[PDB]
Amino acid sequence: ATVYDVPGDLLVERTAKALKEVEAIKPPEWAPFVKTGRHKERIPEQEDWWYYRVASIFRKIYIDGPVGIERLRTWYGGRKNRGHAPEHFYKAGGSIIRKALQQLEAAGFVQKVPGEGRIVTPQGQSFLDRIATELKKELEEQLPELKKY
Amino acid sequence: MQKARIKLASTDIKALNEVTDQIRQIAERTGVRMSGPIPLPTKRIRITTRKSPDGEGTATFDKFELRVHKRLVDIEADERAMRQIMRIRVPEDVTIEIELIS
Amino acid sequence: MAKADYNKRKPRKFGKGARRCVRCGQYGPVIRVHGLMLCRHCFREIAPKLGFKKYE
Amino acid sequence: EGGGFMGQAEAARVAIARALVEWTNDMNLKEKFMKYDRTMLVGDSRRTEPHKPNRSTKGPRAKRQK
Amino acid sequence: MAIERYFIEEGVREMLIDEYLEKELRRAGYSGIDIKKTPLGTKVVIFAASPGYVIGRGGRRIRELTRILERQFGLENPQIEVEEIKNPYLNAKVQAIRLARALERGIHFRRAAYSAIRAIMRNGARGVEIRLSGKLTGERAKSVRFYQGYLAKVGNPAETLVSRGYAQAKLKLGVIGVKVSIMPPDAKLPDEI
Amino acid sequence: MGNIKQMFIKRTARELFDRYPNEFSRDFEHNKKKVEELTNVTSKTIRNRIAGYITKLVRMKEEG
RNA sequence: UGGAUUCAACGCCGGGAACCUCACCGGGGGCGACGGCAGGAUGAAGGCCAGGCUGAAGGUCUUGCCGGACACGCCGAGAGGAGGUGCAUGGCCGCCGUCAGCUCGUACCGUGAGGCGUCCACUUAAGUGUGGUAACGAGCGAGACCCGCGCCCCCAGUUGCCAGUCCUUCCCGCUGGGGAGGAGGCACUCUGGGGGGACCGCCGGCGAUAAGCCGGAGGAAGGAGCGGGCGACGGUAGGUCAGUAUGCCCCGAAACCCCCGGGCUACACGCGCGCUACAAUGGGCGGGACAAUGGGAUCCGACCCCGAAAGGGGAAGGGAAUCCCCUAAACCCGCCCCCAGUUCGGAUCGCGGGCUGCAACUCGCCCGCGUGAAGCUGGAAUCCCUAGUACCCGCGUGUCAUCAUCGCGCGG
Ligand SMILES: [Mg+2]
Ligand SMILES: [Mg+2]
Ligand SMILES: [Mg+2]
Ligand SMILES: [Mg+2]
Ligand SMILES: [Mg+2]
Ligand SMILES: [Mg+2]
Ligand SMILES: [Mg+2]
Ligand SMILES: [Mg+2]
Ligand SMILES: [Zn+2]
């Protein structure tokens, strides 16, 4: 079983819940404040959004490999209401994803190729594939046409 | 043996072909191994002016275009081959560039 | 007549005064896309001579 | 490796239809496909028409208001 | 330096050269030039109809000219030489300029136009058209087209085969525009022999 | 819309048909090859239009 | 400051003006080529030390200054003029109009101007064709032609692609499967040169049996395949002498040139084109996806670090199928909101933090907190559009030091 075998959103929430049990995934003191980007209008409405965000980043680094902060910024960005003016795409802030990546390198899940960004470690892909095989079972109670895989 | 890239670019496919045929026939005159004229994506410099000075009247546009065709050829670097490909005529409306991979 | 000449051709580095067509000498609608510096009018007049064609 | 989710889905549909036909050599199946949706085996040739001046961003025939 | 930059630069430079020489050698039937950057230097070739006029008095003209060339225009080592048009009467900008020169001498426009047409169609052109536009026959301006033979206007064969030429005749009272179009003895698509 | 054999197409077809009648079949492909080895064309669509016209002329002759 | 005022002016003059741009305003300073005239270098034509004026100025000046050298103090005669004249012109553009028209040779008709052809009927996008016909022929234009897209073949295999093969390695574990890097090779894709292919060709019907139209088959493509470019003779005193060129008139030491500052950005109002909305056919939050076109040298900038953001420091590679801009948005999943001036709407304004630039007040762009304007679908009337089109969604580029609700384009 693997990340590509299961869906994304379910996996992210499950692995977030599991990441709460990791000690190097403390939120920073400025989390309850700030938005995720200039493209946003409002603070996150959840309290565990930090864990959801680092879970997402972890999966993204699994999939896309030697990737860094600017690439992730454009993925976590989006559309802004610019008032009476038309809508455009804006990237997100870098501090969230940087602190996340650094927390993950502390916990042991990603490493930092000198060039070309950050790369998941074996313990990291183990973590993710474990959660994925678990999830796959729990929704193989449903679709046996997915038991197949 | 170390290789020689020949990047050549023009506005005329026929001059371009002339040069590539020069190279083909000279390599087979000798026996050095050619790497084909790989055709690279051709550059379309597009310039969309308004064709009116007055600013009055309906707005109409001239889409002018310049096309640059590009080929590359890799041939093993020998002193003979290099001397004679230097001797090549290389007509006026063409650029070339002999880099060497070593 | 002991004085100081004060024409002061000031060297603009950015602006519609910085850029000038090499032909007529116009300051505004200047083409600078691929190293050109030409007024749209002139360009339309001479583009064939440069090799630009109008196939579309 | 292309444009949209729907285009990708159709291109995939085409590719696997052809794959099945060339894997099986079953012309009864080929004809089943060709009468369900011919474009399953032949491609949709349509592309987007180039945009033309008057309010070109919108379309080739989309025009400014008078 | 990118490659398209190079092409653009060469074209622009050559165009400005062409402009200057069009101004200064209009008595000579300056048809054009060509330029090659040989290793020993850049050698250019002026195609005109009176090399006598472009050389002047024992190379005086080419000498001050090459000075101008290397100075005002970036050129490694100018090596001007001169050549003729093989059939200037099939060239059309030389003829436009000859006609403008005539109108400036003072010849009447119908006479000059019909003379040039006769000359071209005897020198072997399939067709010729000549527009004169301006203050002809008084103060209100008009346009007159003198034509003979067979001439196409529209399409790629026109854009390629027929030779177009333009000139101004700067007279006492104003400008006369001279458009000339010449179709030589070469064939089109719907012939089908 | 409208697809109509122009005059020079038709004239060329008729002249070929009169000059070399028994060379032109009722087959469009054959007639194509024949017009091509005959008259200089350099234009596929023109060649094909001429071929089609002589094709149906042949047919009209077989009919009377 | 101006130009343009129905179609064909009014997001047009590529006109997104901080200076420049600029043509307006207030102020300040330079300019006579050629000759001659008042003279003459005697040490100065010209620059010029510290200051006063000055917005600031060797501009000027009492006071003094020399590096070695002619003349607006005066005339003509000029340079330059974004000064006037687009009913003096050229060139270009628009419109009539991508409309189907404009003509010719010979013949005939008519005293003649002129006519005929070029008419009629069908047909066509087409004065495109068929037939009839004092007309027969021809030419420009249309079409042909050129560019691109879409299917196949050949060639070519890098900087492009990675299926197959081998090697090495990492995870799940249900021991089945997944990915990654190296040679491998051009298979697939892709690129770009050359060819092929579609012609109402076949069947049937309608029209006349013709021209041709229609339905169908087969085909990648079906009815000029689709979309563009090339805009006839000529008119429009259409617009442009404020892009260049140019006649005349005028300025000509000011209407020429340069600098500072302001203005073109003013606002009781009328109009055009548009953006955002008036919500659930939704808003927010968090998660999940999928592009193409183009561009890059003092330029793109991955990658790392700092920062809440905007942004800042360092910086691989990249002169361009090698690197970057560039993981788009509309869409989907879950959670809050449940028909109300609202968790709709974001005008306005306050505080603060930044980028560009010489300069951000007049007058730039960005960020954060806060504020919380009208508006609850819109009369009369009117616009665009026939297929990958319209609508909706975002992106690129041009303009660009910084500025995109714009233009030209791209795909979904
Ligand atoms: Mg008529
Ligand atoms: Mg045409
Ligand atoms: Mg066809
Ligand atoms: Mg006019
Ligand atoms: Mg007028
Ligand atoms: Mg709101
Ligand atoms: Mg309501
Ligand atoms: Mg604009
Ligand atoms: Zn110019």
CATH class label, F1-64: mainly alpha
For chain A, give the DSSP string.
Answer: --TTTS-SHHHHHHHHHHHTT-TT-PPPTTSSS--SBTT--S--S-SSHHHHHHHHHHHHHHHS-SB-HHHHHHHH-EEEEETTEEEEEEPBPSHHHHHHHHHHHHHTSEEE-SSS-EEE-HHHHHHHHHHHHHHHHHTTSS-HHHHT-
For C1-56, give the DSSP string.
Answer: ------------SSSTTT---SSS--SSSEE-SSS--EEHHHHHHHHHHHT-B---
Q: Is D1 helix (H, G, I), strand (E, B) or coil?
A: coil
Domain, as residue range, for E168: 87-193
Domain, as residue range, for B10: 1-102
Query: What does the CA dihedral F10, F14, F20, F25 come to, rounded to 10 degrees?
Result: 70
Residues after which chain A is broken (C–N above 2.5 A) are none
Resolution, rounded to a tenth of an Å? 2.8
Is the domain of E193 the same as that of E111?
yes
Query: What does the CA dihedral A133, A134, A139, A143 come to, rounded to 10 degrees?
Result: 30
Distance CA C31, CA A147 (A): 63
Looking at the 3D structure of chain A, how many domains does it have?
1
Six token digits for residue E3: 């490659």
Task: Nearest by CB to B50, from C40, C47, C53: name it.
Answer: C40
- Who contacts D15 (Cβ-Cβ below 8 Å, separation ≥6)? none
Pairing of strands E41-47, E163-170: unpaired
Q: Which helix (H) or strand (E) holds B74?
A: strand B61-76
Six token digits for residue B85: 């490909």
Six token digits for residue A139: 């929704």
Domain boundary pick from E86, E101, E134: E86
Distance CA C53, CA C47 (A): 7
- Who contacts A17 (Cβ-Cβ below 8 Å, separation ≥6)? A51
- Who contacts C35 (Cβ-Cβ below 8 Å, separation ≥6)? E5, E8, E9
Is the domain of E111 the same as that of E91?
yes
Six token digits for residue F5: 């054999």
Six token digits for residue E39: 């290793």
Taking only Cα atoms into account, the Rg of chain C, rounded to an integer number of angstroms, comes to: 17
Distance CA E10, CA E44 (A): 13
Asked if B102 has any chain D CB less than 8 Å from its own CB, the reply is no
Count of H-run helices and E-run strands, chain B: 2, 4
Give B92's Cβ-side CA count (13 Å radius): 11
Distance CA E181, CA E160 (A): 12
Beta bridge mates, E134? E142, E176
- Who contacts E62 (Cβ-Cβ below 8 Å, separation ≥6)? E54, E55, E56, E80, E82
Of the candidates E8, E39, E46, which has an alpha carbon nearest to the alpha carbon of residue E25?
E46
Strand G: which residues 147-166 of E lie within 7 A (CB)? Answer: 150-159, 166
Six token digits for residue D66: 């008078």
Distance CA A14, CA F36 (A): 72
Which bases along strand G come within 7 Å of a protein CB atom? Answer: 3-4, 7-9, 12-15, 19-22, 28-31, 44-48, 57-61, 66, 73, 82, 88-95, 98, 123-126, 128-130, 139-147, 149-151, 155-159, 162, 170-174, 177-181, 189, 191-194, 196-202, 210-213, 220-221, 223-235, 237-240, 243-248, 257-260, 272-277, 283-292, 294-297, 301-311, 316, 319-321, 325-330, 333, 335, 345-347, 357-358, 366-369, 382-401, 405-412
Strand G: which residues 13-52 of C lie within 7 A (CB)? Answer: 13-19, 21, 23-34, 39-45
Of the candidates E174, E175, E177, E176, which has an alpha carbon nearest to the alpha carbon of residue E164?
E177
Give A134's Cβ-side CA count (13 Å radius): 12
Residue of E nearest to F12 (CA): E192
Does any strand G atom come closer than 7 Å to the Cβ of F53?
yes
CATH classification of the domain holding C47: 4.10.830.10
Q: Which helix (H) or strand (E) holds B47?
A: strand B38-50
Looking at the 3D structure of chain C, how many domains does it have?
1
Cα F51 → chain centroid = 3
Q: Is D13 helix (H, G, I), strand (E, B) or coil?
A: helix
- Give the full edge-to-edge strand order of the sheet including B94-101: B38-50, B61-76, B3-10, B94-101
Of the candidates B44, B40, B99, which has an alpha carbon nearest to the alpha carbon of residue B71?
B40
Distance CA E112, CA E97 (A): 12
User: Which segments of chain E are extended strands (E)?
Assistant: 32-38, 41-47, 81-83, 127-134, 142-149, 163-170, 175-183
Is the domain of E110 the same as that of E59?
no
Count CB-CB contacts under 10 A for residue E184: 19
Distance CA A137, CA E13 (A): 73
Pairing of strands A110-112, B38-50: unpaired
For residue A107, which amino acid is it?
A
Looking at the 3D structure of chain E, how many domains does it have?
2
Chain B contact set for E36 (CB, 8 A): 92
Pairing of strands B94-101, B3-10: antiparallel
Q: Are A67 and A112 in contact (CB under 8 A)?
A: no
Of the candidates A126, A95, A96, which has an alpha carbon nearest to the alpha carbon of residue A110?
A126
Q: What is the 3-state secondary structure (H, E, C) of F21-62?
A: HHHCCCCHHHHHHHHHHCCCCCCHHHHHHHHHHHHHHHHHHH
Domain, as residue range, for A11: 1-149
Distance CA B15, CA F21 (A): 44
Distance CA E167, CA E93 (A): 7
Residue of E nearest to F36 (CA): E192
Chain E contact set for B70 (CB, 8 A): 3
Task: Nearest by CB to E15, from C34, C35, C50: name it.
Answer: C50
How many residues comprise chain C? 56
CATH classification of the domain holding B35: 3.30.70.600
Of the candidates A74, A72, A77, which has an alpha carbon nearest to the alpha carbon of residue A118?
A72
